[PDB]
Every structure is written in C-alpha cells, then in structure tokens.
Amino acid sequence: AEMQRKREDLIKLNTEYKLKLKNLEKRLLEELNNSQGNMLENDELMVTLNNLKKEAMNIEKKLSESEEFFPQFDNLVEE
Amino acid sequence: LIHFDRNFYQKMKVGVNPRSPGYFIDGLRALVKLVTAKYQDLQENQRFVNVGLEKLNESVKSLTFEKERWLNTTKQFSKTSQELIGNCIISSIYETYFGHLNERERADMLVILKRLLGKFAVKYDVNYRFIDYLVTLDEKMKW
C-alpha cells in the first residue's frame, strides 16, 4: 500500500514542483525588474525563495528515491 | 523507422502482405513536425535560463550564489537535447502506429522499438512516458 500511494505523488509532485519551479522563476523575475532601483522588496519573495531551497532540492530528493522505486515497481509487475 | 515498419506488419497484422506503406510516410511526417516543435521549445527554455544567467550576474548576496551555481540545469540541457531525436521517434510512432493497438500490443512494440533504438547510435530517455512527454497539465485537466 505504501508504494502504490507514493506512485501517484511521484509523478504528481514531479510535474507540480516543476510547474511551481517555472511558476516561481516567473514571480521572481517580475519583482526583480520592478524593485531593482527600489528597496529589497525582492527579499519578501526571497524568503519564499528560501522556502524554494526545500522545493528545488525536494525535486532532487524525490528523483534520488525514484531510481530506487522504479526498479522495485518493475519487480512487482511480474508476480 | 524502416526496421520498425517492417516489424509492425510482421508482428501485428494478419493476412499475408496484401497491405503496405502508409503509416511509414505519416510516421516520418510526425517526427519532422515533432522535432521542430521540440527543438524550438528546447532552445526556448535554454533561452530562459541564459536570460536568467545574464540577470543574476548583473546583481552580484548570501544565498544568491547558489542560484548562480545553477549550471547543473545549464549542464543538464546537453543530456536533454541528446535524447530528443530518439524521443521524438517513439512519440511519432505512438501517434501513428499505436492508436489502434491493445494495451499489451503497444508495450510490446515499444520494446522492439527501444531495442532498435538500442542497436542504433541513438539516445533515448530510459525512464520515458508517452503521456507526460506530450500531454500538458492544462490539457490533461481539460480532457
């Protein structure tokens, strides 16, 4: 039950976080062009980009366990 | 593609060689339309990380040099582009030859295709999925 539950979120958070990676890159560049001569407002998005240090590396966390999950999935298809 | 079409009729179709090349032409026409669609979009995202490389260098501060160290993504692009030619091969074949095949009949041809991709000096994504590769989450929702 543990691996069929994680199978759904594996390709879900694969696409979700990569769409959030494309979504947060856009939110960052919009305020960097608005606030460049202004104060460090970008900082108010950079604490969200500090949260992104979990998100960018969340991807890397899940890709690492994928290379471990997939060959176990394919072992279970045979029975 | 020749070795695939020759294998498609050989495995799938029953009735001895009444019928001949159709899909082959359309399979080729799909690849051309797919590689041009993908190389225009590979270079579009490569242009989005090159325009972000220009913008981070202008600024430089404590954590921002981790973002600069995003040559892992820039390094990653070469591996992504290496496989797009052979990835488009499988995608084109799925659109053309697979539409009317069984669950099992699709998978099995994929094997013969992938091992044909294995003999040739063509690089493909080993962890590959037709849905995720050509379906967009906005369309996947819509359907």
UniProtKB/Swiss-Prot annotation, chain A:
Subcellular location: Cytoplasm, Cytoskeleton
Coiled-coil features, chain-numbered ranges: 1-70
Taxonomy, superkingdom: Eukaryota
Assembly and binders: The dynein complex consists of at least two heavy chains and a number of intermediate and light chains. Interacts with DYN3.
Extra facts: Present with 195 molecules/cell in log phase SD medium.
Known role: Cytoplasmic dynein acts as a motor for the intracellular retrograde motility of vesicles and organelles along microtubules. Dynein has ATPase activity; the force-producing power stroke is thought to occur on release of ADP. Required to maintain uniform nuclear distribution in hyphae. May play an important role in the proper orientation of the mitotic spindle into the budding daughter cell yeast. Probably required for normal progression of the cell cycle.
Family listed: Belongs to the dynein heavy chain family.
Domains (record comment): Dynein heavy chains probably consist of an N-terminal stem (which binds cargo and interacts with other dynein components), and the head or motor domain. The motor contains six tandemly-linked AAA domains in the head, which form a ring. A stalk-like structure (formed by two of the coiled coil domains) protrudes between AAA 4 and AAA 5 and terminates in a microtubule-binding site. A seventh domain may also contribute to this ring; it is not clear whether the N-terminus or the C-terminus forms this extra domain.
Official protein name in the record: Dynein heavy chain, cytoplasmic
Source taxonomy: Eukaryota, Fungi, Dikarya, Ascomycota, Saccharomycotina
From Swiss-Prot, chain B:
Covalent S-S links between cysteines: none
UniProt subcellular location: Cytoplasm, Cytoskeleton
Other observations noted: Present with 195 molecules/cell in log phase SD medium.
Domain notes: Dynein heavy chains probably consist of an N-terminal stem (which binds cargo and interacts with other dynein components), and the head or motor domain. The motor contains six tandemly-linked AAA domains in the head, which form a ring. A stalk-like structure (formed by two of the coiled coil domains) protrudes between AAA 4 and AAA 5 and terminates in a microtubule-binding site. A seventh domain may also contribute to this ring; it is not clear whether the N-terminus or the C-terminus forms this extra domain.
Summary of subunit composition and partner proteins: The dynein complex consists of at least two heavy chains and a number of intermediate and light chains. Interacts with DYN3.
Family: Belongs to the dynein heavy chain family.
Function: Cytoplasmic dynein acts as a motor for the intracellular retrograde motility of vesicles and organelles along microtubules. Dynein has ATPase activity; the force-producing power stroke is thought to occur on release of ADP. Required to maintain uniform nuclear distribution in hyphae. May play an important role in the proper orientation of the mitotic spindle into the budding daughter cell yeast. Probably required for normal progression of the cell cycle.
Protein name (database record): Dynein heavy chain, cytoplasmic
Lineage: Eukaryota, Fungi, Dikarya, Ascomycota, Saccharomycotina
Gene: DYN1
Parent-record interval covered: 2969 to 3379 of 4092
